[PDB]
Amino acid sequence: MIQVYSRHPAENGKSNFLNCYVSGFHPSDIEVDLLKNGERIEKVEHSDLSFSKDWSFYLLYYTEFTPTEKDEYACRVNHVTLSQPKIV
Amino acid sequence: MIQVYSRHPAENGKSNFLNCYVSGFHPSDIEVDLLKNGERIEKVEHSDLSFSKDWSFYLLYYTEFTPTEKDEYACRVNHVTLSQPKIV
Amino acid sequence: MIQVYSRHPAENGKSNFLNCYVSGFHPSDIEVDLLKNGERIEKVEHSDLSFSKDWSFYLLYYTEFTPTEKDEYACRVNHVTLSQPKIV
Amino acid sequence: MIQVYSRHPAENGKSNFLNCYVSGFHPSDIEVDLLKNGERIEKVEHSDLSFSKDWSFYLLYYTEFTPTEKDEYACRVNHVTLSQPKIV
Amino acid sequence: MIQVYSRHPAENGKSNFLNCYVSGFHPSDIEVDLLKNGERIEKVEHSDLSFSKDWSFYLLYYTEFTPTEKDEYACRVNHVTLSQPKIV
Amino acid sequence: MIQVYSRHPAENGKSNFLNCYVSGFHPSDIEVDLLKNGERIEKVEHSDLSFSKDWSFYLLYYTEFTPTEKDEYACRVNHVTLSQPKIV
Numbered sequence A, B, C, D, E, F: 001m002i003q004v005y006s007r008h009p010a011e012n013g014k015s016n017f018l019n020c021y022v023s024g025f026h027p028s029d030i031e032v033d034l035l036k037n038g039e040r041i042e043k044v045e046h047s048d049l050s051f052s053k054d055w056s057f058y059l060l061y062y063t064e065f066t067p068t069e070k071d072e073y074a075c076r077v078n079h080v081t082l083s084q085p086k087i088v
Helices: none
Strands: A002-007 A010-012 A015-018 A028-034 A037-041 A055-061 A068-073 A076-083 B001-007 B009-011 B015-020 B028-034 B038-041 B055-061 B068-073 B076-083 C002-007 C010-012 C015-018 C028-032 C037-041 C055-061 C068-071 C074-085 D002-007 D009-010 D016-017 D028-034 D038-039 D045-050 D052-061 D066-074 D076-078 D081-083 E001-009 E011-014 E015-017 E028-034 E035-038 E045-047 E053-063 E070-075 E074-077 E081-083 F002-008 F010-012 F015-017 F028-034 F036-041 F043-048 F056-061 F066-071 F077-078 F081-083
Touching: A002 A076, A010 F066, A055 F015, A076 C002, C002 C074, C068 D009, D002 D038, D002 E035, E070 E081, F002 F036
Parallel strands: A002 B001, A002 C002, A010 B009, A010 C010, A015 B015, A015 C015, A028 B028, A028 C028, A037 B038, A037 C037, A055 B055, A055 C055, A068 B068, A068 C068, A076 B076, A076 C074, D002 E001, D009 E011, D016 E015, D028 E028, D038 E035, D045 E045, D052 E053, D066 E070, D076 E074, D081 E081, E001 F002, E011 F010, E015 F015, E028 F028, E035 F036, E045 F043, E053 F056, E070 F066, E074 F077, E081 F081
Antiparallel strands: none
16 A cells, blocks of 8 residues: 655745735725815704714624634645555 | 655746635725815705614524534635545 | 655745735725815804724623634645554 | 926937947836826825836746857947037 | 926937947836826825836746857947037 | 926936946936825825835856856947036
């Protein structure tokens, strides 16, 4: 029983990894305005400019939270497994 | 029983990985305005400019959350498995 | 029983890893304003400009939090496992 | 209000003349501009003005470079005269 | 208010003349600009003006570099005259 | 209010002339600028003006560098004259 694993790659260049995993709440480039340039305005009342309310990543009420999760977050992954079982 | 695995690639160049995985709430390039340029305006009242309400990635009420999940997030993945079982 | 693992790669270049894992609440490039340039304004009242309310990453009410999770967060990962069991 | 008074009255024999041998990368008199004269501009986003990325005169992969050359660069220039008199 | 008075009246034999051998990377008279003259500009974001990244004259991978050359650079220039008289 | 009075009246034989052998990386007269003249600008963010990154004349990987050369650089220049008289 012979099991041979040979790996010798040549990477002739530079490697660049950016923003491998992005998730969650990330809004961007949002502009909200009221009366940006205002001239001769008699009255402004009851202006409501609220971007967001309460923030909570995990909100649970009377909950049974039992997840079984195996995860692997990365940019470059190498997984190699050699098995040579012998049973008599 | 002979099991041979030979891998020797040549990568003649540079590699660029960007934004491999994007998910979630990410709105962009949104503009909301009221009376951008305002001249001789007698009255502005009851203006409602709210981008969003409460934020919550996980919201569970009386829930049984039992997911069994194996996941692999990456940009470049290499998975190799050699098996040579012998049973008598 | 012979099990040989040979790995000798050549990386002819520089490696750059940036922002491997980003998550959570990260909003950016958001501008909210009211009456940016204001001239001859008689009255401004009841202005509400609140970006966010209470912040809480984990909020649990009457909850049983029992997750079984094995995770591996990284930029570059190398996982190698050689097994050669013998049973008689 | 933007007022620009730019004048380039006189040029005599500006560049690249009376040369025996010219080669390589020599671009000249190239102008790249975005919003050269701008007034009351609200938002400029995501502008890419990269001229070039990589400069490599010799880039060889698994190559056998054996050029044989005999070159004689013998130019002869006689009685060159450049005159730019200015009288005020 | 921006007022600019720029004048470049006289140039005589500016560059790259009477040369026996010119080679390599020699770009000239290249202008790259963004919003050269700007008034009342609110937001400038994410501007990339990178001219170049990497300068490598000899970049070889697994190469056999054996150039044989005999070169004679013998130019002859006689009686060159440059005159730029100015009278005020 | 920005007022700029810049004048460059006279240049005679500026650069790179009467040279026997010129090579390599020699860019000249390159101007890169962002918002050269700016008034009442609110926000400038994330500006990249990197000219270059890495300068390597000889970059070799697993290379056999055996160049054989015989070069004679013998230029002859006679009676060069540069005159820039100024009378006020």
